[PDB]
Design a protein around this ligand. Structure first.
Ligand SMILES: Nc1ncnc2c1ncn2[C@@H]1O[C@H](COP(=O)(O)OP(=O)(O)O)[C@@H](O)[C@H]1O
Ligand SMILES: Nc1ncnc2c1ncn2[C@@H]1O[C@H](COP(=O)(O)OP(=O)(O)O)[C@@H](O)[C@H]1O
Lengths: 53, 53
């Protein structure tokens, strides 16, 4: 009974940990994509910008 | 829902980027052609020009 309820709490912490990691992965990747969009936009600002070469 | 609407915005930026690049390619090539036309015209001004050799 003691080992079971201890384990149940540990299991709950495990579920929470997994959910947070899943969220972090999702966020990480969208940020890489958003960073790349910004980089691409900057290069278009260069080419379709002012005067230069 | 959150990831979807984020992605939709990112997708819109992607479409815009692609359109601008397409325009830049079109413009680039016509300019090379116009530059070549100018060069050719200059050589005809030379040959069918004034006096020389
Ligand atoms: N004569 C120019 N006019 C505009 N931009 C130039 C010129 N020469 C170089 N640039 C480059 O283009 C960018 C123009 O600055 P930016 O702040 O992007 O324009 P804006 O303030 O109109 O958005 C600069 O980062 C600069 O490196
Ligand atoms: N005696 C000449 N008469 C006219 N052009 C000459 C003569 N000798 C050399 N040229 C060459 O031909 C060009 C004539 O100048 P250009 O401004 O093209 O003529 P226009 O002013 O009549 O259009 C010059 O770039 C020059 O290099």
């Amino acid at each position: 009974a003691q080992q079971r309820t201890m384990s149940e709490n540990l299991r709950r912490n495990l579920a929470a940990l997994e959910a947070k990691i899943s969220e972090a992965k999702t966020k990480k990747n969208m940020l890489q994509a958003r960073a790349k969009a910004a980089k691409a936009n900057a290069e278009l600002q260069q080419t379709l910008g002012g005067l230069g070469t």
